[model samples]
Target: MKMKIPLDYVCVRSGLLCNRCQSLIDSGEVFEYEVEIIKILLDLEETQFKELKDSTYHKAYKVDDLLILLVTSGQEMTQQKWIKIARILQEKLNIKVRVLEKTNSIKNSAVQLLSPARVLGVNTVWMPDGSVQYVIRVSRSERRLLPAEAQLLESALTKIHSTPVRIRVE
Candidate 1:
């Protein structure tokens, strides 16, 4: 009557122009803002960020009886790691999860693309370039996440959702 969510590897998407996070990505920074966020969360005992830098996920178990929890950024999923992890998981477990990379349409266009299943947490606005400029999540499920874990994620995402960047030029 219960399920275990994969609370590992928080996907932090980076942008090439955002003031808060551009320096790290362009300068070949591995422990970029994304890395820092993951470390902090891990230290706080929130979700577990997997060690597989490339593409990886938890070992196989059952098909329809798994919850892959991914803490994705509100920005661009431009990093090779994001792509690798996504594909690896798909190939390994047949789970479909797309860490949305904010686009110009999502940025310049005020129109919201699609909302989540529920609005238990706060709201966020995905930038045009695919960075989580702002986000918030509040869940009353006491059994799912610890107080610190939920708060840590909620706080990080709230600020992360505030990050903004220009429309990606492709």
Candidate 2:
């Protein structure tokens, strides 16, 4: 059965959820999206098994051989977890989160070591087949990325893929 829920709920549950994105959703200030809960815990990776018990779905994870299951929300609908968190960031605190359509090198979300400036976008809605969600733009301040996702962002940005045509490496 289908249910009505905020995109944050789904994104939060997904292991790849960005800290800045989560905070914005929690504050009730983000652009809310009515996410259609697709599989609940069905497609969750073995690495994400421990988060099922938490309320509101805010949880962290450890990297392993399991698939980097990402719950996403965006303009178009296809597959790969889906949801939306809106108006999460108003004034830039320290970090920023933005979504991009593609990357120049390393076609997948970096699971470790992120540079403060190299973070492609705040929260990316990437597909399971190693494809990023189609977006106009996305970014979050250091506040959203670090602290909650501080270390995670650090790990991811430090070694992110280059943007298309841009030969800069973080």
Candidate 3:
């Protein structure tokens, strides 16, 4: 399977980093804790998740007890498949796993990340200094349905988009 991952498959499995992989870790492009996660994904690729062969593993973010995996897929996979994959990873890693599909639209990505909770709209705020921030507005009624706290979700969105994000419940 031609799975796109930042670290080399052989190097991750062997527990030894070659120069290229080592540099990625050193430069903080990849984290050491993610090696085990990648190993598990690679193992699953050969066994259960054949669909992962066309996916690119972008990065992982650990927010409290939840682990969010950002991946981009070339093939269209059903939401059920992604949920199943998340459940399996959660069982193996002993942490809540959320498999988020990275998309070109930040609003779509935000909506996916905060499932079950409806997003009113996404507002863009541009600063005079040429910086941009995103505000995700959700109804106050759906606060109970939020997967995580607003602050945590904000940080997760920031990491995913690499831009300032704020969640407003109204």
Give the candidate number with the greatest TM-score.
Answer: 3
Candidate 2, superposed: residue stretches over 4 Å from native: 1-81, 84-102, 105-147, 162-170
Indicate which candidate wins on lDDT: 3
lDDT of 2 by residue, 80-134 (tens): 2221111121121122323222234332344222322344534445678775542
lDDT of 3 by residue, 29-127 (tens): 788878878888788788788887877787889978878888876485567877888888889889877788887678988888888899899999998
Candidate 1 wrong stretches, greater than 4 Å: 1-100, 103-118, 121-139, 142-148, 163-170
Give the poorly placed runs of model 3, Cα more than 4 Å off: 1-5, 128-130
Clashing pairs in 3: none
Model 3 alpha-carbon miss at residue 27, Å: 2.6
- Whole-model lDDT for model 3 versus the true structure? 0.83
Kindly give the stretch of ten consecutive residues in candidate 2 with the minimal lDDT sum.
83-92
- Total backbone collisions for each predicted model: 20, 44, 0
Each prediction's whole-model lDDT (CA): 0.33, 0.31, 0.83
